[PDB]
Amino acid sequence: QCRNSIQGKHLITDELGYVCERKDLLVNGCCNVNVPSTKQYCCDGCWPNGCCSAYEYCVSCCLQPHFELCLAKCRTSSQSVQHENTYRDPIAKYCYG
Amino acid sequence: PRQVAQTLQADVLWQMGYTGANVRVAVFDTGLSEKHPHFKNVKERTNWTNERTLDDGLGHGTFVAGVIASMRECQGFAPDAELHIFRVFTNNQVSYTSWFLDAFNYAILKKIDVLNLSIGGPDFMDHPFVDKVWELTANNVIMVSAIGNDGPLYGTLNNPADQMDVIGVGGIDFEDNIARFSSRGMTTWELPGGYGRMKPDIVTYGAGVRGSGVKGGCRALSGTSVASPVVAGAVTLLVSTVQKRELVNPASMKQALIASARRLPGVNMFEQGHGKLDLLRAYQILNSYKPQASLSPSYIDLTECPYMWPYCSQPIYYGGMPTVVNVTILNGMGVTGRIVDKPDWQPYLPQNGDNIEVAFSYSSVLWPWSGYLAISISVTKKAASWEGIAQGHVMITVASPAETESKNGAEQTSTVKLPIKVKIIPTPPRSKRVLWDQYHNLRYPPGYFPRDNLRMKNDPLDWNGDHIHTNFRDMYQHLRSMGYFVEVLGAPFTCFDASQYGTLLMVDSEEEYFPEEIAKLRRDVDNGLSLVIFSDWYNTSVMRKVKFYDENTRQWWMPDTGGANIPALNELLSVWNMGFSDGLYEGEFTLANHDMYYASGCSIAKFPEDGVVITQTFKDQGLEVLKQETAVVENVPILGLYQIPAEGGGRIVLYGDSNCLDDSHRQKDCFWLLDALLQYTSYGVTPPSLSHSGNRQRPPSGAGSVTPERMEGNHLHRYSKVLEAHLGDPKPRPLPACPRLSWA
Ligand SMILES: *[C@@H]1O[C@H](CO)[C@@H](O[C@@H]2O[C@H](CO)[C@@H](O[C@@H]3O[C@H](CO)[C@@H](O)[C@H](O)[C@@H]3O)[C@H](O)[C@H]2NC(C)=O)[C@H](O)[C@H]1NC(C)=O
Ligand SMILES: CCN(CC)Cc1ccc(C(=O)N(CCc2ccccc2OC)[C@@H]2CCNC2)cc1
Ligand SMILES: [Ca+2]
């Protein structure tokens, strides 16, 4: 029974390091590896500065060969906003670096 | 003395053995004392403010927590709740978004169940905050917040209580009358193009409820921030009653309260939502609940009211603007949902359903636990001369991933009806039809737009939406009482048929005007359409004085524009050789034996000679703001009538102040004047009051008057719908296409 990123709107990241669409997620909490939609340690949407455009990609890249630490870290925090009410980089708000 | 918990019969649930056990409740307030005698199971206290203390200096976090989980004296709903106290407010109730963002993550880390936010803010364009609430609610946190304490004005809702996924709580009194302070109205995210959802969700007692004191005892407080924790206590208590905890999510919890509320008699649904909370009945609904989708409101009836106001205020007819009801979907089956196919409109031919055509827009994916279904209703041609009732229902289907217990892996499914009932009447004559301009309104939150009456220091923003159902509600009701059918224009001037409407009413406009719009409007007026323009103050010098420091963002804010965008109106009004001045005026005056009050309006700089201009004496408010000196100005042109020389042409009425029809802080109402001016525009009848008056004077010629100018480096383009963000000398975008609907 894999732990997973519960909140994903379209995607889910499993504690094994895969990113999968909701439709392909198993009822055991793991991503279905047998389906091509499941990708391993997918750092897509991530820039060299360690920031990513999607939460699940951030979590997956954080587990590149720690789950709670990656889950908490990738979230937007006070360090991701400027003047309290604007993102510093709206396109890459999630950062694992 | 009173006990709110007993008034809602919470002790009946206590006798059943339910007391809030193992429910993790987070109170986001001014903190709590270290060893307060009234509380058990206070598992943590943390501080997210810059102040170095976890104690409750103000006592608001103590009152809120006690209403939820107090066990002594004035008792609470959930004595055994696992309280979590996160101090995010100062002793004077100041807070910042970064504090909330950091605290919200910690609440996710600690897997809290019920979160209470007693103090909200008008801003909803703060995307970092709004996204975190969605991320929070996506992690199964039931959020409860107050709608605000700025009533009885409409359009005064607060965020995040105005979100679809949050339970927004209002305030009634112990006689079940709506508390005067409680915020009311529809949401305003969707304006001008759309329509707002129904808020508040439910109301509860918020007048003189007694709760814990800082060191002990009990004390009284009033507000919707008092009404919110009453629901958080009920929500915490109800969550403990559920045998199968998995059924509890933000959608299902909200559905229970919605369906168990009691409807206050004589009050509309934008004041009470679904009604007053009923704790016992809500418990019964959860006891027999099945994961299902539901709609708020559950049915459409534009005929029977006062519950369904404004929709009952006037019937529909052929050629009228579409009637839109933004209906909320709550999906208790999953965080992510979907609408299987197009919703189905099913008219009842036995009851004239075919006289209606219904259109639908909806969310791509319902997330988190909620979404919307906007229904647009219009009358077909066959009913243009018909009077009666048209009926039918709408069917939607929601699907969500497979539940854990289902080994089959099939999608969950729920089907919901939505009855529709409408009153149709023959299309009224043009003279009786008034079009209301909403497209050219700009408002906070998006950007800084100053107040209209500069004496109202306490409210420095224009944020109520400027709608005939929010802060022009009293104007709207009087016009209906006079027989005028008022309709709203949510798209540029290039998107309405002038031949349908006798008068176009522009009140306190801030937006720039497309060149195509000006040309189109000129032709419509030449063909018998009338313009009534109520304006407000504008001055580049006064604006630089109205500048104030915004503490919540830590940055100085300059007015994007004045009360009204006088330069933009002048570019529109040039085609008839008319314009406005950049003067400031206030003071009392009399017209036709009626007392009047000029709030901060401007004056008519230029007017055609053939027109009727009545002029008055006023105090120079511009000098006071700039230099605190006093002066009186005689013969100020504030009202101007005109008739287009072309045969069958329209009329233009100019009035320099918008505040006599606004409810925000009304001192005197100028509805008698609006009625007389609509009589002139709708029938050409010049009243004796505005023609025999001794206040008449030769219309100003505009010789030597300095034209108002746009402020240097103003950032209005960042938020304008017309202007490109060129960072300097902004220019209009291409004219956007008119909106279209896909009728079923
Ligand atoms: C009813 O109210 C809801 C919210 O209360 C409104 O939903 C919002 O609708 C807009 C479009 O009108 C959505 O914007 C979307 O943005 C991006 C643009 O790149 C794209 O995903 C879509 O094409 C769409 O334009 C917005 O996300 C949506 N908000 C929510 C929270 O779902 C709705 O418009 C209102 N309907 C009416 C008829 O007033
Ligand atoms: C003078 C009146 N205001 C206009 C300048 C100040 C103001 C107040 C609130 C917001 C405002 O909304 N938030 C700021 C956080 C906040 C501060 C204080 C109280 C409640 C809060 O939220 C829970 C957030 C952003 C989105 N929703 C809430 C913004 C501005
Ligand atoms: Ca306005």
Side-chain angles (χ1 to χ4, degrees):
Chain A
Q1 180 170 354
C2 304
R3 290 176 287 180
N4 62 87
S5 304
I6 296 160
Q7 73 210 49
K9 182 169 184 169
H10 310 281
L11 273 51
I12 291 289
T13 303
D14 52 11
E15 69 178 316
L16 303 179
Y18 301 78
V19 185
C20 63
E21 271 81 4
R22 288 277 193 162
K23 298 182 178 72
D24 298 330
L25 189 81
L26 301 172
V27 296
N28 64 14
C30 302
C31 290
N32 192 352
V33 178
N34 306 282
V35 184
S37 316
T38 303
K39 300 173 183 178
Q40 69 188 340
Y41 314 113
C42 190
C43 301
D44 196 5
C46 301
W47 296 95
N49 63 358
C51 295
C52 308
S53 66
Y55 181 64
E56 286 77 16
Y57 289 132
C58 180
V59 176
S60 182
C61 203
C62 182
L63 296 152
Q64 268 274 353
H66 308 294
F67 193 58
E68 306 299 337
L69 283 67
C70 290
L71 282 179
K73 187 174 185 187
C74 277
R75 291 202 206 285
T76 55
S77 73
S78 57
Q79 83 200 359
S80 304
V81 298
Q82 56 181 337
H83 306 304
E84 302 296 325
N85 74 343
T86 302
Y87 287 107
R88 290 165 72 185
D89 192 355
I91 293 167
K93 63 180 76 162
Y94 310 93
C95 310
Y96 62 83
Chain B
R2 278 279 190 170
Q3 294 271 18
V4 69
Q6 275 79 352
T7 304
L8 303 187
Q9 310 195 5
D11 56 344
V12 177
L13 295 185
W14 297 341
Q15 285 175 0
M16 291 177 190
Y18 304 118
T19 56
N22 295 343
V23 188
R24 300 189 199 97
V25 191
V27 169
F28 277 54
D29 208 357
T30 61
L32 189 71
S33 303
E34 206 171 50
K35 278 77 70 176
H36 200 288
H38 290 187
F39 294 102
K40 310 180 294 182
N41 205 14
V42 176
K43 198 159 287 290
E44 204 172 320
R45 295 157 74 237
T46 61
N47 184 36
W48 313 90
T49 73
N50 65 323
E51 303 182 318
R52 301 181 182 180
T53 181
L54 291 151
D55 303 347
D56 189 3
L58 184 63
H60 194 267
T62 301
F63 176 94
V64 164
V67 171
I68 295 164
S70 174
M71 62 168 178
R72 289 180 72 85
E73 303 185 79
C74 49
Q75 292 174 326
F77 287 84
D80 300 333
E82 186 185 303
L83 294 174
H84 290 258
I85 306 299
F86 297 173
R87 185 178 158 100
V88 304
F89 290 89
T90 67
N91 294 345
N92 56 332
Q93 297 186 341
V94 182
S95 191
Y96 304 85
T97 292
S98 58
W99 298 0
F100 272 103
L101 293 181
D102 284 359
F104 276 137
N105 285 345
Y106 205 73
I108 293 165
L109 178 143
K110 297 284 166 155
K111 299 293 183 285
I112 66 162
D113 299 315
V114 179
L115 185 144
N116 189 238
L117 182 49
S118 296
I119 298 164
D123 193 351
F124 53 78
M125 300 289 291
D126 188 326
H127 308 311
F129 188 102
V130 171
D131 294 351
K132 190 64 64 175
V133 176
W134 286 334
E135 171 175 37
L136 182 85
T137 56
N139 287 258
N140 217 55
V141 175
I142 292 153
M143 185 165 192
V144 184
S145 192
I147 60 191
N149 306 320
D150 304 332
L153 181 69
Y154 281 59
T156 43
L157 305 171
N158 276 268
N159 186 271
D162 69 345
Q163 289 190 1
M164 285 182 283
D165 57 357
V166 175
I167 294 159
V169 187
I172 48 160
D173 62 357
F174 278 121
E175 296 191 42
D176 303 347
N177 299 136
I178 296 283
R180 194 169 186 270
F181 51 76
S182 196
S183 283
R184 303 145 151 86
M186 71 189 209
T187 68
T188 56
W189 308 5
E190 297 81 4
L191 292 175
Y195 203 76
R197 290 155 288 118
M198 181 215 76
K199 287 288 173 165
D201 299 295
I202 58 171
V203 298
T204 188
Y205 296 119
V209 169
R210 287 176 64 257
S212 295
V214 177
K215 299 287 100 175
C218 297
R219 62 170 184 159
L221 282 179
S222 301
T224 62
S225 58
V226 172
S228 172
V230 166
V231 181
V235 166
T236 306
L237 181 53
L238 287 165
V239 169
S240 82
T241 65
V242 178
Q243 299 298 129
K244 291 186 177 184
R245 292 288 210 278
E246 295 301 329
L247 299 171
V248 170
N249 53 53
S252 68
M253 178 54 59
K254 187 163 178 167
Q255 288 174 336
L257 311 171
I258 290 283
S260 54
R262 312 179 80 93
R263 196 177 294 181
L264 286 56
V267 178
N268 61 298
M269 71 185 196
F270 291 95
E271 291 204 334
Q272 60 177 305
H274 278 85
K276 57 179 284 208
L277 170 66
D278 195 333
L279 172 59
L280 290 190
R281 188 170 159 76
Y283 160 65
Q284 290 289 3
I285 290 177
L286 283 174
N287 186 46
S288 58
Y289 174 83
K290 54 180 172 71
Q292 67 196 351
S294 75
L295 300 165
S296 296
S298 311
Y299 73 102
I300 308 304
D301 187 344
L302 325 179
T303 78
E304 188 171 314
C305 82
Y307 185 62
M308 281 282 308
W309 182 99
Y311 301 109
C312 82
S313 63
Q314 73 175 14
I316 307 171
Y317 47 79
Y318 175 66
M321 281 273 189
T323 304
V324 182
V325 179
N326 203 324
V327 180
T328 309
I329 297 160
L330 303 173
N331 177 20
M333 311 185 309
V335 63
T336 44
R338 188 261 306 278
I339 288 162
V340 175
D341 201 4
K342 203 82 171 185
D344 192 25
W345 163 237
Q346 302 191 345
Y348 300 160
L349 299 185
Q351 193 170 4
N352 291 79
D354 58 326
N355 302 143
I356 306 299
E357 60 187 341
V358 189
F360 302 109
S361 58
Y362 49 83
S363 312
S364 57
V365 303
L366 306 168
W367 179 97
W369 315 96
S370 62
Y372 68 91
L373 171 75
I375 63 168
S376 305
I377 292 164
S378 73
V379 181
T380 63
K381 289 175 180 182
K382 186 60 161 65
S385 59
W386 174 67
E387 184 176 2
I389 294 285
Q391 284 198 239
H393 67 260
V394 182
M395 297 283 280
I396 62 157
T397 305
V398 176
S400 292
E403 62 191 329
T404 304
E405 183 164 35
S406 187
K407 300 288 98 176
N408 193 32
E411 281 179 298
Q412 305 178 76
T413 50
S414 186
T415 308
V416 176
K417 273 175 62 174
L418 180 70
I420 293 177
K421 180 177 176 184
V422 305
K423 181 68 181 292
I424 307 312
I425 64 155
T427 306
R430 307 176 65 240
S431 293
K432 296 192 189 187
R433 294 179 68 176
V434 182
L435 190 59
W436 169 263
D437 184 2
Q438 191 70 46
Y439 182 77
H440 299 99
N441 183 72
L442 285 167
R443 51 163 297 147
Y444 188 77
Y448 175 56
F449 300 99
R451 60 190 179 281
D452 288 340
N453 188 352
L454 286 187
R455 275 179 70 181
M456 307 291 93
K457 296 290 208 299
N458 51 308
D459 193 2
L461 296 163
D462 200 335
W463 63 288
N464 295 133
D466 295 335
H467 199 273
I468 46 166
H469 295 146
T470 72
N471 86 359
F472 282 99
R473 188 187 174 277
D474 299 347
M475 175 182 77
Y476 171 82
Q477 291 294 120
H478 189 79
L479 286 179
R480 284 297 309 130
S481 85
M482 293 292 104
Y484 293 94
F485 299 84
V486 194
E487 308 183 47
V488 179
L489 170 61
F493 287 140
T494 59
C495 309
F496 80 99
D497 177 8
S499 76
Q500 298 171 346
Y501 313 95
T503 305
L504 165 60
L505 181 55
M506 306 167 65
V507 182
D508 194 75
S509 305
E510 298 89 338
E511 188 73 275
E512 294 291 335
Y513 298 90
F514 287 104
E516 293 81 11
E517 279 185 304
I518 296 160
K520 198 272 190 179
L521 184 47
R522 182 183 67 73
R523 290 187 286 260
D524 288 348
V525 166
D526 294 341
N527 294 340
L529 181 73
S530 296
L531 276 170
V532 178
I533 304 176
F534 276 62
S535 197
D536 206 1
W537 76 269
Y538 179 86
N539 190 302
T540 298
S541 301
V542 176
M543 283 160 65
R544 202 167 290 132
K545 295 285 290 189
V546 163
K547 174 191 73 178
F548 65 85
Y549 182 83
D550 181 33
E551 295 181 312
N552 303 266
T553 53
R554 302 184 277 107
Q555 184 178 21
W556 280 95
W557 279 11
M558 276 291 294
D560 292 338
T561 190
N565 185 355
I566 293 299
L569 268 175
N570 287 354
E571 277 165 17
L572 166 57
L573 275 297
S574 68
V575 301
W576 306 281
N577 300 305
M578 290 168 173
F580 276 121
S581 61
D582 64 347
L584 273 293
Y585 302 95
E586 161 174 16
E588 299 88 346
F589 64 106
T590 54
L591 288 179
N593 302 310
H594 296 140
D595 299 342
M596 293 273 286
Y597 172 72
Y598 211 70
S600 291
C602 62
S603 161
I604 305 169
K606 183 164 60 179
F607 212 69
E609 294 291 327
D610 194 33
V612 167
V613 169
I614 59 171
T615 182
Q616 259 290 0
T617 182
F618 291 119
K619 204 187 193 190
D620 189 336
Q621 193 182 84
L623 184 62
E624 287 198 333
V625 174
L626 262 63
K627 302 187 179 179
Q628 285 96 349
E629 298 184 3
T630 58
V632 172
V633 182
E634 293 289 309
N635 301 326
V636 181
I638 56 154
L639 180 139
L641 278 57
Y642 183 59
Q643 184 177 2
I644 297 286
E647 183 171 30
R651 292 149 198 103
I652 306 182
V653 171
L654 265 65
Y655 191 78
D657 186 14
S658 70
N659 292 277
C660 65
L661 306 167
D662 191 350
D663 301 320
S664 302
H665 306 286
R666 194 159 61 226
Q667 301 208 7
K668 301 290 173 71
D669 62 298
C670 73
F671 301 154
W672 75 270
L673 185 75
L674 185 67
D675 298 341
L677 298 170
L678 290 181
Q679 192 71 3
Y680 169 70
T681 59
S682 290
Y683 304 89
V685 175
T686 315
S689 52
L690 302 173
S691 58
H692 297 176
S693 189
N695 298 306
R696 282 182 69 182
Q697 180 164 307
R698 183 174 173 186
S701 62
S705 58
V706 179
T707 50
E709 300 196 326
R710 290 171 181 75
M711 181 165 73
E712 178 174 15
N714 77 324
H715 296 171
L716 182 135
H717 51 84
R718 286 181 183 178
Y719 319 117
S720 176
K721 302 180 295 299
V722 175
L723 274 61
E724 293 186 335
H726 209 177
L727 307 183
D729 298 345
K731 305 164 186 64
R733 289 171 176 122
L735 178 80
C738 298
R740 299 183 182 187
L741 293 165
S742 63
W743 309 98

